[PDB]
Write an enzyme that holds these catalytic residues in place. Structure first.
Site, PDB file in Angstrom:
ATOM      1  CG  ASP A   1      -1.943   1.110   1.186  1.00  0.00           C
ATOM      2  OD1 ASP A   1      -1.935   1.908   0.228  1.00  0.00           O
ATOM      3  OD2 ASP A   1      -2.752   1.186   2.131  1.00  0.00           O
ATOM      4  CB  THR A   2       2.127   3.398  -2.747  1.00  0.00           C
ATOM      5  OG1 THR A   2       0.907   3.445  -3.497  1.00  0.00           O
ATOM      6  CG2 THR A   2       3.045   2.333  -3.339  1.00  0.00           C
ATOM      7  N   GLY A   3      -0.232   4.161  -0.470  1.00  0.00           N
ATOM      8  CA  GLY A   3      -1.020   5.203   0.154  1.00  0.00           C
ATOM      9  C   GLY A   3      -1.085   5.132   1.663  1.00  0.00           C
TER      10      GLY A   3
HETATM   11  C1  LIG Z   1      -1.410   9.254   7.574  1.00  0.00           C
HETATM   12  O1  LIG Z   1      -2.525   8.700   6.946  1.00  0.00           O
HETATM   13  C2  LIG Z   1      -2.342   7.387   6.504  1.00  0.00           C
HETATM   14  O2  LIG Z   1      -1.303   7.045   6.049  1.00  0.00           O
HETATM   15  N1  LIG Z   1      -3.436   6.450   6.620  1.00  0.00           N
HETATM   16  C3  LIG Z   1      -3.367   5.168   5.945  1.00  0.00           C
HETATM   17  C4  LIG Z   1      -4.440   5.145   4.862  1.00  0.00           C
HETATM   18  O3  LIG Z   1      -5.703   4.616   5.147  1.00  0.00           O
HETATM   19  N2  LIG Z   1      -4.128   5.691   3.549  1.00  0.00           N
HETATM   20  C5  LIG Z   1      -5.281   5.855   2.679  1.00  0.00           C
HETATM   21  C6  LIG Z   1      -5.280   7.287   2.162  1.00  0.00           C
HETATM   22  C7  LIG Z   1      -5.510   8.257   3.311  1.00  0.00           C
HETATM   23  C8  LIG Z   1      -4.326   8.955   3.992  1.00  0.00           C
HETATM   24  C9  LIG Z   1      -4.579   9.925   5.141  1.00  0.00           C
HETATM   25  C10 LIG Z   1      -5.999  10.204   5.606  1.00  0.00           C
HETATM   26  C11 LIG Z   1      -7.175   9.516   4.932  1.00  0.00           C
HETATM   27  C12 LIG Z   1      -6.936   8.544   3.781  1.00  0.00           C
HETATM   28  C13 LIG Z   1      -5.184   4.955   1.455  1.00  0.00           C
HETATM   29  C14 LIG Z   1      -4.866   3.502   1.805  1.00  0.00           C
HETATM   30  O4  LIG Z   1      -4.243   2.930   0.691  1.00  0.00           O
HETATM   31  C15 LIG Z   1      -6.134   2.726   2.149  1.00  0.00           C
HETATM   32  C16 LIG Z   1      -5.729   1.337   2.642  1.00  0.00           C
HETATM   33  C17 LIG Z   1      -6.969   0.480   2.894  1.00  0.00           C
HETATM   34  C18 LIG Z   1      -7.249  -0.747   2.014  1.00  0.00           C
HETATM   35  C19 LIG Z   1      -8.488  -1.598   2.269  1.00  0.00           C
HETATM   36  C20 LIG Z   1      -9.442  -1.236   3.391  1.00  0.00           C
HETATM   37  C21 LIG Z   1      -9.170  -0.025   4.268  1.00  0.00           C
HETATM   38  C22 LIG Z   1      -7.935   0.838   4.028  1.00  0.00           C
HETATM   39  N3  LIG Z   1      -6.952   2.570   0.966  1.00  0.00           N
HETATM   40  C23 LIG Z   1      -8.320   3.041   0.931  1.00  0.00           C
HETATM   41  O5  LIG Z   1      -8.838   3.480   1.905  1.00  0.00           O
HETATM   42  O6  LIG Z   1      -9.004   2.957  -0.286  1.00  0.00           O
HETATM   43  C24 LIG Z   1     -10.332   3.239  -0.280  1.00  0.00           C
HETATM   44  C25 LIG Z   1     -10.693   3.941  -1.544  1.00  0.00           C
HETATM   45  O7  LIG Z   1     -10.725   2.971  -2.410  1.00  0.00           O
HETATM   46  C26 LIG Z   1     -11.229   1.639  -1.593  1.00  0.00           C
HETATM   47  O8  LIG Z   1     -10.245   0.416  -1.857  1.00  0.00           O
HETATM   48  C27 LIG Z   1      -9.737   0.028  -0.718  1.00  0.00           C
HETATM   49  C28 LIG Z   1     -10.512   0.700   0.324  1.00  0.00           C
HETATM   50  C29 LIG Z   1     -11.191   1.914  -0.379  1.00  0.00           C
HETATM   51  C30 LIG Z   1      -3.554   4.063   6.977  1.00  0.00           C
HETATM   52  C31 LIG Z   1      -2.176   4.038   7.908  1.00  0.00           C
HETATM   53  C32 LIG Z   1      -1.662   2.775   7.873  1.00  0.00           C
HETATM   54  C33 LIG Z   1      -2.815   1.849   7.282  1.00  0.00           C
HETATM   55  C34 LIG Z   1      -3.679   2.838   6.381  1.00  0.00           C
END
Ligand SMILES: COC(=O)N[C@H](C(=O)N[C@@H](Cc1ccccc1)C[C@H](O)[C@H](Cc1ccccc1)NC(=O)O[C@H]1CO[C@H]2OCC[C@H]21)C1CCCC1
Lengths: 99, 99
Positions: free
Chosen positions: B25-27
């Site tokens: 997960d690059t995000g």
């Molecule tokens: C500093 O803040 C982070 O670093 N917080 C990180 C984070 O949640 N990053 C978020 C972006 C973001 C960044 C900051 C604030 C708000 C949002 C993106 C991440 O890749 C999530 C991972 C995921 C995959 C399956 C289920 C749940 C969550 N994907 C997502 O939620 O995708 C969604 C849209 O499409 C759908 O598909 C998949 C799920 C849907 C957490 C930290 C470590 C773990 C994650």
């Protein structure tokens, strides 16, 4: 190009005639952009993340240009804290993970 | 290897001697794994994503092997919907985005 992951992989995108910064997110099934008033029809949708779900508006066949690479697909719009480019569009620009 | 994104970039990981599936997960800034027992001390922490925050247990300097590549860093454990490998460990295994 190649993007390291020391910092968040933020890039410039062009959508609906506007430039924005967005996160290249291999962990996102879908593409979610901050609130913006795109034209055309839309459908309600719920997307779930790490902490729960939010309400978004689903726009279909939207053009986005990512680092000069064009992609057309579904774009969700809602109260997300960060613009997220998900796999539905990353595949269209030939994006891969490599290690 | 080179990984395309037509499907979720799921890989097998080894942590605490147990095998698991996890999402590259690059995000994600951090690495968070579903509820599990890990040796060593831990301290409470909060992480936020789409939907809000969750309470996690932070384990520091944990060994984890990701697709045959060793990493030693911070691993969060909590009610995440999916096992997520974030940038703190992706950098250790030399992972980059390319298009
Ligand atoms: C500093 O803040 C982070 O670093 N917080 C990180 C984070 O949640 N990053 C978020 C972006 C973001 C960044 C900051 C604030 C708000 C949002 C993106 C991440 O890749 C999530 C991972 C995921 C995959 C399956 C289920 C749940 C969550 N994907 C997502 O939620 O995708 C969604 C849209 O499409 C759908 O598909 C998949 C799920 C849907 C957490 C930290 C470590 C773990 C994650």
């Amino acid at each position: 190009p190649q993007i390291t992951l020391w910092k968040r992989p933020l890039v410039t995108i062009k959508i609906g005639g506007q430039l924005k910064e967005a996160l290249l997110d291999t962990g996102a099934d879908d593409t979610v952009l901050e609130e913006m008033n795109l034209p055309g029809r839309w459908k309600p949708k719920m997307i779930g993340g790490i902490g729960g779900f939010i309400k978004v508006r689903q726009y279909d066949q939207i053009l986005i240009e990512i680092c000069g690479h064009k992609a057309i697909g579904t774009v969700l719009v809602g109260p997300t804290p960060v613009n997220i480019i998900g796999r539905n569009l990353l595949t269209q620009i030939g994006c891969t993970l490599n290690f």
